Design an enzyme around this catalytic site. Structure first.
Site, PDB file in Angstrom:
ATOM      1  N   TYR A  14       0.827  -1.215   0.000  1.00 48.08           N
ATOM      2  CA  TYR A  14       0.000   0.000   0.000  1.00 48.08           C
ATOM      3  C   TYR A  14       0.861   1.265   0.000  1.00 48.08           C
ATOM      4  CZ  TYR A  14      -3.123   3.714   1.693  1.00 48.08           C
ATOM      5  OH  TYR A  14      -3.786   4.918   1.860  1.00 48.08           O
ATOM      6  N   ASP A  38     -10.332   8.845   6.952  1.00 46.83           N
ATOM      7  CA  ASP A  38      -9.063   9.518   6.738  1.00 46.83           C
ATOM      8  C   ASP A  38      -9.306  11.021   6.642  1.00 46.83           C
ATOM      9  OD1 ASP A  38      -6.539  10.392   5.934  1.00 46.83           O
ATOM     10  OD2 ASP A  38      -6.188   8.652   4.651  1.00 46.83           O
TER      11      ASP A  38
END
Length: 125
Positions: A14, A38
């Site tokens: 990632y 986020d």
């Protein structure tokens, strides 16, 4: 359901995709019904297109960087947490953001949930 070692591999992967700014590759790590918080605290975004839009908004400018700042901590139930630093550019001024990301992976090795912990206290110039 990834093993602890596979979790370490997926989460390091990632970070690599973020670092090279491959939006398409990142979106594909996510399950069809994944959620993304986020920064954690904000409402979660859902679905592949909205996640795609999120990463385009953040990485589309091309110059964003990222690297692990310590090992991935993995569980035996498909989850992990990792510390990292994101280097980005608001007005030409370099800034850095310290983040910890927590992920749960599904039975197919895809990200089911991601939560990214940070706030302004984690930003520096």
């Amino acid at each position: 359901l990834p093993t602890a070692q596979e979790v370490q591999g997926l989460m390091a992967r990632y970070i690599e995709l973020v670092d090279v700014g491959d939006i398409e590759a990142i979106v594909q790590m996510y399950a069809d019904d994944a959620t993304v918080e986020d920064p954690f605290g904000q409402p979660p975004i859902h679905g592949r297109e909205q996640i795609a839009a999120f990463y385009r908004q953040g990485l589309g400018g091309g110059k964003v960087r990222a690297c692990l700042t310590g090992p991935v901590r993995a569980s035996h139930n498909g989850c992990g947490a990792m510390p990292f630093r994101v280097e980005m550019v608001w007005n030409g001024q370099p800034c850095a953001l310290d983040v910890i990301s927590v992920m749960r992976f599904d039975e197919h090795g895809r990200i089911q949930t991601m939560q990214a912990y940070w706030s302004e206290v984690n930003l520096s110039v």
